[PDB]
Ligand binder design. Structure first.
Ligand SMILES: CC(=O)SCCNC(=O)CCNC(=O)[C@H](O)C(C)(C)COP(=O)(O)OP(=O)(O)OC[C@H]1O[C@@H](n2cnc3c(N)ncnc32)[C@H](O)[C@@H]1OP(=O)(O)O
Ligand SMILES: CC(=O)SCCNC(=O)CCNC(=O)[C@H](O)C(C)(C)COP(=O)(O)OP(=O)(O)OC[C@H]1O[C@@H](n2cnc3c(N)ncnc32)[C@H](O)[C@@H]1OP(=O)(O)O
Ligand SMILES: [Cl-]
Ligand SMILES: [Cl-]
Ligand SMILES: [Cl-]
Ligand SMILES: [Mg+2]
Lengths: 264, 265
């Protein structure tokens, strides 16, 4: 934090961030899925609240803001490795981890901007216990309704709904490994194996551990895909404070990713 | 790091095992309790913060009352800041631009992940102070949180006094007396600290306003010493929740002790 204020010239505010967003190409009425590192921007007056307000100010309620709200800590620990936990714990975990409830369950590894966004009034969250998304604005409901349990990031997911809307991806101080949309590419290309997974959900007031099938999503190759992707020169670079940012069309990178995976 | 935390845990902490530790320590149905916590101190928990919030609710129940501080010192006048400070050219820009306190939105600072989870629960209500708010759930949640004064934020018009009147309890989960907000009421009652001009952004008659008011220069760095001397009386129940060293005490007990302690100088 001292290091954060030391590397900032002037405070970042809703105003300067709004300014930065516009200069990068974000504009009123866009559909945008946002991925962020708060700290990467520099010191901000109002922290995560400023970033969220700045985004809503640029996009407005006539546009749509989306952010991933994953909650991987609800998953079956059979498959954990960062870190793993003892096998003797696994059935205890399956019988005791609390059910997902959209209005309550914290995200994991999404960031403070997402934790703040998902709590705002009028923000709605899809119902997936592991791979949910939150959305605000014109298409918030359409984007978040009826996510499939199996194939969570596939053709019935919010990622597909953003695709159909010809939306944008905004990366703030993070790389392609945070670019959730490329999972749609994985799905389309068959680039991962299916695995037996589980997660806790509420079925009419009762907690149930639900078993389902999903792709073993792996962001391994996303960074390499982004490098090759940016050689076609359709990604806007720009800064929000100290942060290196990227604005791109979601269909561009999803279509590119699908072909990339197919070539292997 | 999750790696560490896992290492130091023999079996998972769960809603069930936390409920059990809480009851052993002395938490029970219908109790009024203010809670201060470190999540990591407990060891590995299946469900993390949610599990702790749910366990507290399961023990206390709606017929009892859970309170947590939800301070947001990020919103204070930067003239007073030191962990960390910011350049003085920043100060007026901050005053002019920091977003207003909104109880449903404004995040806490330094309160912990259990408080961030708790404050978002559906029937949790939060008091109206831009710097020194509290959140509460259960029987006395409304009475405890309403009508907190802007000036003297942690004094006789605050949730701390309301807890005192309810003869409530304070639970520390892996933390010490420096986290024990209730002791600020002691500072107030004893006149322990000087009155300073403070500020904060609020929504007032329609719009964001930077509001100036007076408050005590609260200082929780004295509380660890008060705590050591208080515990010589043997009225604190000590026990574990997972790996965490915990303490349960009557709020009146420590608030009274602290008032007398400051007055002795
Ligand atoms: S599919 C996968 C998709 N993933 C995503 O969308 C997530 C993308 N984000 C990332 O990957 C990021 O690297 C993250 C979120 C995982 C981590 O980035 P960080 O900036 O370290 O975390 P985050 O965005 O939560 O911000 C919190 C940080 O902001 C900093 N911070 C706190 N207050 C302020 C402020 N007023 N101004 C600026 N920075 C601040 C703190 O350094 C730090 O939190 P900490 O106190 O817990 O260390
Ligand atoms: S008046 C002021 C009164 N203040 C209070 O009431 C605050 C009391 N609390 C404190 O002072 C504490 O020392 C704190 C909150 C400042 C810091 O304690 P921490 O345990 O480090 O933080 P917190 O309680 O937020 O828990 C988060 C941590 O839990 C750990 N954690 C995450 N998931 C889990 C899990 N499932 N099980 C166990 N630990 C976990 C992580 O180590 C760490 O979070 P990070 O990823 O952000 O580093
Ligand atoms: Cl009580
Ligand atoms: Cl007195
Ligand atoms: Cl401890
Ligand atoms: Mg419930």
């Amino acid at each position: 934090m001292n290091d954060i204020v030391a590397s900032t010239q002037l405070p970042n505010t809703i105003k300067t961030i709004t300014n930065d967003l516009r200069k990068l190409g974000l504009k009123k009425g866009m559909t945008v899925i946002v991925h962020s590192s708060l700290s990467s921007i520099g010191w901000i007056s109002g922290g995560a609240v400023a970033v969220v307000e700045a985004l809503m100010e640029v996009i407005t309620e006539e546009g749509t803001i989306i952010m991933p709200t994953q909650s991987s800590d609800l998953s079956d620990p059979k498959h954990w490795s960062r870190p793993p936990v003892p096998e003797e714990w696994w059935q205890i975990i399956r019988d005791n981890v609390p059910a997902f409830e959209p209005h309550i369950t914290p995200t994991r590894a999404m960031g403070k901007v997402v934790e703040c966004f998902r709590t705002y009034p009028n923000v709605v969250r899809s119902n997936h216990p592991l791979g949910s998304f939150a959305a605000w604005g014109r298409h918030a409901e359409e984007i978040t309704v009826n996510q499939s349990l199996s194939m969570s990031l596939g053709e019935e997911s919010p990622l597909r709904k953003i695709y159909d809307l010809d939306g944008y991806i905004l990366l703030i101080g993070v790389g392609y490994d945070s670019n959730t949309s490329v999972h749609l590419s994985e799905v389309r290309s068959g680039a991962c194996e299916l695995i037996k997974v589980g997660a806790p959900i509420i079925e009419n007031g009762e907690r149930v551990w639900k078993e389902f099938v999903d792709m073993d999503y792996d962001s391994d190759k996303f960074v390499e895909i982004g490098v090759e992707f940016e050689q076609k020169g359709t990604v806007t670079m720009g800064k929000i404070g100290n942060a290196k940012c990227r604005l791109m069309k979601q269909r561009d990178i999803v279509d590119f990713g699908t072909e990339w995976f197919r070539k292997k």
